[PDB]
């Protein structure tokens, strides 16, 4: 039952990651190379997370499946609104991850519970950063050059990390 | 109109790549580390291909979209059957790529035509290899150890290559 | 009371470790150098675990005792059966470790609870590996050479690590 | 509400840290360079802990405040009595940290819960050492030279460490 | 009597230093990493000053005490107002230091008088800098990016420096 | 028949080694790091000896078994009494080893006789040292600091040494 929720999380993460590529590609086309570079990177790290969940099920000889990925959002009024979706998403992932921890606790699946511990910390950091990008984006008017300057200056995964 | 077909190919490639992860994870769970390591790699290179198509539309200031990904196959009777799907898939991708070339030629889109040239050559090699893995898999009975030994011994993409 | 269960675990781990030596020496006599080398190593790492528990009680100025060790199994019908005992044992250790975590949680011993967290993760990996050795051993008939090739290719502790 | 208790802990830790400086300065004046050097260091590491708490609230975009610091003890009958206060203090900090863990658990604040995990382990070690200094101090009569010989021989922080 | 005033200065300096941390943490939460980094550093150097005074009393075998620290200001309307408090504070510290020099002169405490000489020079520089940060902050509108770029581009102490 | 006595010696040595861990852990808890460090090491070297015996039977294709280990002593009135047990133990091991040599001589087992030769020499040295630690321990009153200063200043094994 925590197993079923973990599978679903693999799906969520693959989706989340795809959404990042979409966001990265959006920035790339808006000639925001720095933001783009970052979210290209961000998408890869999210893929890593997925593969870490895959790996956990593998290690526990539980059934695992590589899911499809939902359509993701490709059109944005402006860079800030994209950064917003990214923060909003990371906040959601944090919820999902919290819930997994809860379920594992309830089922007294101690292995699952500790395995989620790292993810919780990672989420604190991902949210912290998306939040910062949004604030700084707000501070920079349609002066995206400022946003771009700012970005420029400031468990085992199945397959490897990349 | 070649533009539309190129978008659809971005979707195909992201799908194809996902299917590789599925195959990789399958091998990984069957304790076939060498096969698995390879297809994990294979899936990343396919992702690269997708991103190369993304990059092409970017460079031409044509609309581009990061698609969702179809469900992919996760269960196989045996390693050979998975290798089969991979060959079968790469053959299909070759078709799609040929068809893109044809459409570009027909529309006299000389930029699109030349951009596809590299992909044609890549497909020759990808198919050549999947084909080899299938033959060798056939030669090795249920003696997968032999298959494993064998594997062990023998354009700008948006984001970068991995 | 979690203290009592921790002492007992020190005993279990020393025992587990001894059983590995036994398994290692069995392989060694069967002219399975690779398997043997690994389980000699495996036994040392288990000893390390014991000493990590010793160290925890030391750091908490709680009474600790170096136990004796129960007789362990020395005769096996065949390599596979040995690897089996090893998996079976690591599964048991995981139980013990989970139960410790539970007891500490119940007693609201927050120090004990966190200290166990590492051990949970380690067990996920030890089990994952013994399981893999068993599957591969199954795949290899009485063709132990294949088993051997495969193995060849693929908290603070009191007194330190080894 | 765990947030409130966390703020209060930042205050506690700054206080604790200051008390160490006091202890270090005491030793310094007693011409106990080794003990002094150590507690100067100890005070810095405590400051680090405070800044790690500051950093956690920062990362979670929760309100954080740099508190004042209570008067700390400056006069001691003799080195042993200072070392005593230090052990007694570290034991108290351990309580506070446990309590935080408890509250986070109760409120099901999974992020706070995991973030506290490191601090629990650190406290095991700080207490272990203060306890050792007291025992050895006891063993050394007013023969402080022996105490001195002994000492000589044997999460992100807002700002950095030092 | 200069001794009494020196003790009080130890208190002032510890307080001043704490106020810097507050200012640093404020900037940090406003996503002004450069300003923050600098004032984190600034707070450490102020701590150093305190410890230098501690050391002076130590060297003269005069009674010294590690004081508590007053509450410091944590909320600011905007970065400029914080920089203001910082300048204002350093000017005050300069007064205190001057007054110490005066008292020592009056008491004909030649040792205290010379020991203060270094602190006078340091204050000239600290004030010079806080003043510069304020002017530049004025010049930069709510364009804090400019303030940030600017900062980015442009005796013995008890325990040691840090 | 010398073969039976050799097996029993493997048991003795594993026991002896465990007893050293006990002694090491005792010292560790008494805050005698140097003594502890040494006997941790000493226990490993004893384990080595056991494994050297295992190796001899392995090399001679004689049946060998990894034994359990008897309870060992964990409580001591004071450091000297522990050092005593250690000397007393090594003297006992020397007897056992002599007796093995004798039996091999009687049975005219020339291979066993020579293999024992090294162990005789090693015992001369182990006893020589335990004896020295006892004398020095006697010389040092309850002044253990002196004991500690002193310690600080002054065949194939199945699986390898440590």
Author numbering:
A (entry chain R), B (entry chain U), C (entry chain J), D (entry chain B), E (entry chain E), F (entry chain M): 10 to 163, 174 to 181
Quote the study's own text:
However, in accordance with the published genome annotation, we will continue addressing the protein as BfrB. This study describes the 3.0 Å crystal structure of Mtb BfrB. The molecular weight of BfrB being ∼20,000 Da, the Matthews constant (Vm) of 2.9 Å3/Da with solvent content of 57%, suggested 24 molecules of the protein in the asymmetric unit, corresponding to an entire 432 symmetric octahedron. In the present crystal structure of Mtb BfrB the metal site is not occupied, but the overall structure of the site is nearly identical to that of all the illustrated homologues. The residues involved in the ferroxidase centre correspond to the E22, E55 and H58 as ligands for the A-site and E99, E135 (along with E55) as ligands for the B-site. E54 in Mtb BfrB has a flipped orientation that is stabilized by formation of a salt bridge with R180 (unique to mycobacterium species) suggesting an altered C-site in Mtb BfrB. The 4-fold channel of Mtb BfrB is lined with N152, F154, E155 and R162, where the exterior mouth of the channel is negatively charged while the interior mouth is positively charged. The 3-fold channel is lined with R114, D115, E122, Q123, Q126 along with carbonyl oxygens of S171 and G172 pointing into the channel. Multiple sequence alignment revealed the presence of an extended C-terminal region comprising of 18 residues in mycobacterial ferritins. Although uncertainty existed in the side chain conformation of the Cflexible region (the proximal region of the stretch), the electron density for the Crigid (the distal region) left no ambiguity in the structural definition of this expanse.
Ferritins are ancient proteins that store iron away from the delicate machinery of the cell to be released again in a controlled fashion at the time of need. The iron storage mechanism involves binding of ferrous iron to ferritin protein followed by migration to the ferroxidase catalytic site where ferrous iron [Fe(II)] is oxidized to the ferric [Fe(III)] state. BfrB/Rv3841, the subject of this paper, is a non-heme binding ferritin.
